[PDB]
Amino acid sequence: GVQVETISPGDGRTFPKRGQTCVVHYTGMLEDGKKFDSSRDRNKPFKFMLGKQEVIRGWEEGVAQMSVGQRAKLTISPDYAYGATGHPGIIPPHATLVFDVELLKLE
Ligand SMILES: CCC(C)(C)C(=O)C(=O)N1CCC[C@H]1C(=O)OCCCc1cccnc1
């Protein structure tokens, strides 16, 4: 599954809905702390639409639990991420992923 652990609270009332665009900042890490990517290093938020099937399943499920303004750590099991394939060259097979995600805005 995905485990959502809060870093900073959101407004507690504006949660993303299917068809909305979530504007997030993120840093993705492996369980040992190794960063594999971060939009914070590019200083440009990442956008995805909820329910469109264009991000990994632990994101659709985890970010839907977040209210605008919230910063949380999402621990995602491999079956909710890249499974046995992994992402060629970046994520190994069977990897648990840890994302530090801040939900900035809904568009
Ligand atoms: C390593 C690939 C990259 C940079 C997009 C990433 O880190 C990533 O996946 N990321 C980084 C932010 C969002 C997340 C994502 O969109 O998951 C997509 C993976 C599922 C998928 C969909 C279509 C084709 N291949 C894979």
Two tokens, residue 90:
């970046």
Pocket flag, ligand 1, residue 22 (CB < 6 Å): no
Experimental method: NMR
Domains recognised in the chain with CATH numbers: 1-107 (3.10.50.40)
- Nearest to 106, CA basis, from 56, 70, 57: 70
From atom 24 of ligand 1, which residue's Cα is the shortest distance away?
54
Distances 71 to 8, 23, 89 between C-alpha atoms, Å: 5, 12, 28
Asked if 100 and 26 count as a contact pair (C-beta separation under 8 A), the reply is yes
What is the Å distance from ligand 1's center to 87 Cα? 8
Asked if 96 and 31 count as a contact pair (C-beta separation under 8 A), the reply is yes
Catalytically active residues are 26, 36-37, 56, 82, 99
Pocket flag, ligand 1, residue 55 (CB < 6 Å): yes
